[PDB]
């Protein structure tokens, strides 16, 4: 089963980067290397063997995260089907969210006690303490901010975004998606060591054709320590970032 | 190991167009859908294990088939390294490998006994019947013409081609490149009836990046009767076309 074959890769503390969590980017891709259908088009990637993986996946880690425009294609839940707690953490730089507030999922779980409560990362003074204070009180929710000296041409660095969350108490953090954020966090170095400690994708048996949403780093990325599963339909590869 | 896997997979009389020859599309990719590395980088994708995977599928297989920009990126030999012989064919439009003719690699192989007769596919007209004797006489090879009805907008019906390949007592067919060829026939149907009978795919662990050399094709694609196999290093999905 996927149990035996992801025990190398859940967290745990052989860890280069102390001052970060344990980062774990997983994602399902087409055989083309999309991570959506086109434009109106349904998107069906994962089957059930693996879905079941990714919840599993779920209950090792301390937090979730995605981006901003994930949350607005898909209103996730980003709770764990297995029951076990997990903190959703939503990168949305000038909270375009916050206009939509009330009627996302993953608020409504965070009310209901379903999920937890949700953080979501801006830029500095994005959110004024005032309105962040109503926000707490009314929708649960908590803000994080990037400080200016680490933003550059309006990128926020991902090593300053794992700081704040460790320091948050977040020793793992399981990164979903989307297409961006894979992108950026696949080449992400510090002093040539990656920020991204486990590499799980699963690999679905369609293509999803030219106009799908594409993951494609902007230079080559070769791995360390691959190991692969397959069940019936679906396989996974597991992995490290080389040096 | 493969041999199991692939039984299903290898060429057999369960077709539906008998006009043409049982086709097997198959190639080596990154995960993010890539099959070479950009201008200048080393490409390394399939690891020897799936190396002798192909080997043995060009052992089940009348003939193989490439496009004329990966007989100029790669030289490739085109025989079977198991010895049994495989004819193989390059689709060279405007026999652009005429610049080169002598010191193909495939050209060598056909020449000392290592492998057959290569096969250009060109337009009608391109090589003379005189140029074409006396080739036949130098390099031992052989001129196809598609009809100019069977080109449309420049590209060359793959129907047509296949039919005279079929015509020529070629019974099974193994497609492995280029980007294009694979686009193309992944997308190609007769009256809802994909003229790919067997997909072949070697997934390599390792990113090209986004200028490296991407299949994808123009719309989604559905895949049936999916089986994967994994080794060290690489997996391998086989599936048939859906209608
Ligand atoms: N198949 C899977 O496993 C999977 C998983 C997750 C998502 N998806 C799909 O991915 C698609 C969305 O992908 P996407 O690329 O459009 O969106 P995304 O990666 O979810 O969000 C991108 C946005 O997040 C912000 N962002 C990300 N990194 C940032 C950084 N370092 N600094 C500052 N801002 C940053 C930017 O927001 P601003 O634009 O406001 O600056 C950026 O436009 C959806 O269709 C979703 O269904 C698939
Ligand atoms: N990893 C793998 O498994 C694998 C396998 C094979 C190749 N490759 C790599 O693929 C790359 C080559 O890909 P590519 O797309 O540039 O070349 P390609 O597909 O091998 O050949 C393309 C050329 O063939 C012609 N062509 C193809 N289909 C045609 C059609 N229906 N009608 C008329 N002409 C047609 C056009 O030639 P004209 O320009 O003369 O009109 C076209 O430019 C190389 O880098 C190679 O190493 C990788």
């Known amino acids: 089963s996927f149990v035996?074959?992801?025990?190398?890769?859940?967290?745990?503390?052989?860890?280069?980067?102390?001052?970060?969590?344990?980062?774990?980017?997983?994602?399902?891709?087409?055989?083309?290397?999309?991570?959506?259908?086109?434009?109106?088009?349904?998107?069906?990637?994962?089957?059930?063997?693996t879905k079941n993986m990714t919840q599993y996946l779920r209950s090792?880690?301390?937090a979730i995260l995605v981006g901003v425009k994930t949350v607005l294609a898909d209103d996730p839940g980003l709770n764990c089907?297995?029951?076990?707690?997990?903190?959703?953490?939503?990168?949305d730089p000038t909270f375009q969210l916050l206009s939509k507030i009330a009627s996302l999922k993953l608020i409504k779980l965070g009310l209901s006690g379903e999920g937890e409560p949700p953080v979501f990362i801006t830029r500095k003074g994005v959110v004024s303490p005032d309105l962040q204070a109503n926000l707490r009180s009314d929708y649960g929710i908590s803000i994080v901010e990037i400080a200016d000296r680490d933003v550059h041409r309006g990128k926020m660095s991902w090593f300053a975004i794992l700081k704040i969350l460790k320091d948050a108490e977040i020793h793992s953090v399981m990164v979903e998606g989307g297409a961006t954020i894979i992108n950026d966090l696949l080449?992400?170095?510090q002093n040539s060591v990656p920020l991204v400690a486990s590499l799980i994708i699963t690999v679905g048996p369609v293509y999803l054709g030219k106009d799908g949403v594409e993951v494609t780093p902007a230079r080559s990325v070769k791995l360390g320590n691959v190991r692969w599963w397959h069940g019936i339909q679906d396989a996974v590869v597991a992995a490290s970032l080389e040096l």
């Open 4 to 49: 035996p074959f992801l025990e190398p890769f859940i967290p745990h503390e052989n860890t280069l980067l102390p001052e970060l969590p344990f980062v774990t980017l997983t994602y399902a891709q087409s055989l083309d290397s999309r991570i959506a259908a086109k434009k109106g088009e349904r998107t069906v990637i994962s089957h059930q063997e």
């Open 81 to 91: 089907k297995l029951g076990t707690p997990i903190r959703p953490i939503i990168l």
């Open 187 to 189: 080449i992400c170095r």
């Open 60 to 62: 090792k880690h301390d």
